[PDB]
Write a protein that binds this ligand. Structure first.
Ligand code: NAD
Ligand code: NAD
Lengths: 474, 474
């Protein structure tokens, strides 16, 4: 039977019941003990209501807004008897305002993204710098400094951001042994950054390849994806964004830094979902990825930053997304940007519609003695159906990572505001690994200069294959 | 009751039996009168032989090379009793050499491309400018100057290059009439160029959208297309090319002109199949197109050039391909360029495999008073199966254009070396129209500046939306 990790003796408030909420709720009932009536789901859509009613769970058909979130949520969070848990899996809501609301009411909190109130993503008056995830992330870092410690609030604990942070630590451990780097396993942020520096890790790709396919072809004028379309399109239209490593010798003309913050990121003045990079995964081998902005791009580079006594950074890795979505999403991207506007409709591929395919999601560490090393999951839809209901392979990697964040938080309920990089990676993977299918590490001799230059003059840097000048596609 | 247009009183030698050869052979048998034993096919492929054997057609399994084409084609084309016809529908053969050989022995000739001998396209010792279709077309133009007149030989008479030259003439006449400009239509090149100048036609997209899809999904590591894969990938890896209009005020930094020749073209130092442009078709609306180099991009711009007394160009339209192939081909291109290498296998979708779709292929005249006007064919696969065998919608548009060009050559056998721009377009479209499905003209108020600028800074020219500055994706 499945392990029941803890009893939750308080209200469980799930904000948003979309593709990820539908997959997470079954996992919460499976691995936690509690009275079913103590759970409550909040979502404005009629489709979510009918699903919630099919589960016999309390439902409030309401959109959480800046105007109503205090009056709406505080009664739900303080209903008792004990400590409540706010599980935020929504769009169009401010992760920071809800997070702060839960903390000051003594309720645990978890989400999978730093989401802003509706209007932010397309606000015409915001500068590209303020539209970046770097800026959104700095609002959570500022909150953590203004109110250190307290009730635990786990920020950005999905598959990516989230799971991949744990994969980076396990990958670093594996690389140390394989490169025969002597030493004791790191137990602090400073020790981890120092290990990556000592291993010669110049950068990291969040290298992903989704091969799931449906029984019907991509409909015309319909955006298709295996997870949130609204969320993917929104982040796809934000600036391309990456953690900027100290080994880089070149950035493009339309790249910009930040005047304040942790200083670990840059951004390009162009949408990320229409920005290609050269990357690599085990199933796909050499492929194009899209440089979509993610929280872990900034948080991983910042976490693995080494500073001198003066506070200046002397080592940090490059880190960014390299996303090859399912073929219907690639076509949807080609369609959307080719038209200049969102499609008239969208849909998320369901477990009942997907014929085959996997979601290969891992971290690719490069620049070290063995060139490149990819570590991550290869979960298949066949395995997904066999172990978890109401979700495809993309959704299970995410929902299982929310399960591990919830377990860690109940076991560490007074750790303050934390990101996935602050969680005990070994305990989190122990919870999640049953839902990840094969988890493997693989070396490769491939580099972004393979087969280059070709028959056209090209702006490459042959001294160092992994320079961003060689990765970025023009 | 199919019309039989002409008797062919000599040998019919068809070089190549791929997708286009298979679709063209039934049309030759259908529309021309000749003794069955006069037609012979030459193709080195084993798959081709078995097909031809099943049609009861003579087949010589041999590659036409530089070291054998004289001793092979001369006897075959001069077998008598009178004039033969060389139908060249192959890859890796020299169109020019075979064409000059046919003319030297009084045989008519037609092809759909200026193809070089094997080894030319990927030769590392060639500058990009030498690998341009502009350079190839100049060899044909020079051959015409060195031997004016003589036996007719039709260069590049397929769907595009070929049929789209006739669409431009019809579109120009339609635009005039829609403006209330009656009167005698042009009958010389000078008058045609003047008409385009007088109507304010700033440029022309060969605007195409293929919607044919297969009963199976895109297989991994396979390049899929509705026509020649080897032919498509070769031109896709050639530099991007376009006829360069006199109204253009900007070109990229990696754009180059030519020192010699007609002087109508530029090229970019990047592969066309990885270069995107903003265009439009009736069924697709606003879409991305690929800037694949094509012969008609130059010949149309050249044909519609107006010069002053000194010989300098005072008007010329911009002209280039804006190709949106089928979805599997879009995926194939993403896969080929993302990995940096041709796939291990390829296949051309057969009519038995295609489940639905059309080949929407026409010309988009822009810059005039009515903004933009699309004229062309919307042939569907369903109508294709009802009227012609052994081909899909893409192939039928090509084979029927070859049919049209053969009719014109047989009717005008002493015209010398000619391009599709030099043919009687009303007679050619009279022959081809039964195989083009809906042939319609559509006006649109769309421009490349639709919805721009976005949330990012952009280098655009708001005074003239159709400037290549705004069309080219950057
Ligand atoms: N880190 C990761 O790995 C990861 C992976 C997938 C999704 N996500 C994120 O998780 C979130 C949920 O993803 P999903 O696939 O379920 O998205 P989805 O679009 O399928 O679901 C969104 C749900 O939120 C609801 N909603 C919209 N506005 C709301 C409001 N104002 N208040 C309350 N609810 C509202 C909708 O009714 C819908 O049911 C997204 O924001 C996405 O960015 C993260
Ligand atoms: N203008 C147009 O509208 C248009 C459209 C499609 C294709 N084309 C052109 O038509 C040509 C044929 O197209 P397809 O779809 O039939 O291509 P295909 O790849 O389906 O067929 C090519 C054939 O040429 C044969 N071949 C290869 N080397 C040869 C040699 N040395 N001698 C004789 N035969 C040889 C192959 O065996 C093959 O059967 C291509 O060159 C392509 O560029 C033009």
């Amino acid at each position: 039977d499945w392990p029941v990790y803890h009893r939750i003796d308080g209200p469980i408030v799930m904000i948003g019941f979309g593709s990820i909420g539908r997959g997470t709720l079954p996992l919460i009932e499976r691995h936690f003990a509690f009275d079913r009536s103590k759970l409550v789901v909040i979502d404005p859509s009629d489709e979510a209501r009918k699903l919630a009613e099919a589960r016999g769970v309390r439902f409030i058909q309401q959109a959480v807004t800046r105007d109503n979130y205090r009056e709406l949520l505080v009664p739900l969070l303080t209903a008792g008897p004990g400590q409540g848990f706010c599980v935020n899996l929504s769009v169009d809501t401010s992760s920071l305002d809800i997070m702060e609301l839960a903390r000051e009411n003594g309720a645990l909190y978890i989400d999978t993204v730093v989401e802003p109130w509706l209007g932010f993503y397309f606000d015409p008056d915001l500068k590209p710098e303020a539209r970046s995830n770097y800026a959104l992330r700095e609002t959570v870092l500022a909150a953590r400094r203004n109110k250190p410690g307290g009730t635990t609030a786990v920020s950005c604990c999905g598959a990516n951001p989230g799971m991949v942070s744990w994969f980076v630590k396990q990958a670093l451990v594996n690389l140390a042994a394989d490169l025969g780097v002597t030493g004791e396993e790191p137990t602090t942020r400073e020790e981890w950054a120092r290990l990556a520096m000592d291993l010669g890790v110049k950068g990291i790709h969040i290298a992903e390849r989704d091969t799931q396919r449906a029984s019907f072809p991509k409909p015309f004028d319909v955006f298709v994806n295996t997870e949130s379309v609204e969320g993917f399109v929104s982040e796809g239209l934000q600036p391309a964004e990456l953690g900027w490593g100290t080994f880089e010798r070149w950035m493009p003309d339309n790249a910009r830094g930040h005047d304040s913050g942790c200083g670990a990121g840059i951004y390009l003045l162009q949408p990320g979902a229409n920005t290609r990079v050269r990357s690599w995964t085990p199933t796909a081998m050499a492929q194009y990825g899209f440089l979509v902005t993610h929280n872990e791009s900034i948080s991983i580079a910042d976490f693995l930053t080494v500073r001198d006594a003066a506070g200046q950074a002397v080592y940090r890795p490059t880190c960014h997304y390299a996303y090859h979505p399912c073929n219907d999403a690639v076509l949807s991207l080609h369609e959307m940007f080719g038209s200049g506007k969102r499609q008239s409709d969208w849909r998320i591929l369901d477990e009942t519609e997907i014929v085959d395919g996997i979601d290969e999601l891992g971290v690719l560490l490069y620049g070290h003695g063995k060139n490149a090393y990819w570590y991550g999951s290869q979960l298949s839809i066949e395995e997904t159906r066999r172990i978890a209901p109401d979700q495809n392979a993309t959704g299970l990697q995410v929902s299982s990572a929310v399960l591990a964040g919830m377990v860690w938080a109940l076991e560490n309920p007074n750790a303050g505001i934390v990101e996935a990089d602050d969680l005990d990676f070994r305990r989190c993977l122990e919870v999640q690994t049953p839902y990840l299918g094969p988890v493997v590490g693989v070396y490769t001799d491939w580099t972004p200069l393979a087969g280059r230059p070709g028959l056209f003059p090209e702006d490459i840097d042959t001294s160092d294959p992994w320079q961003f000048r060689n990765v970025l596609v023009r």
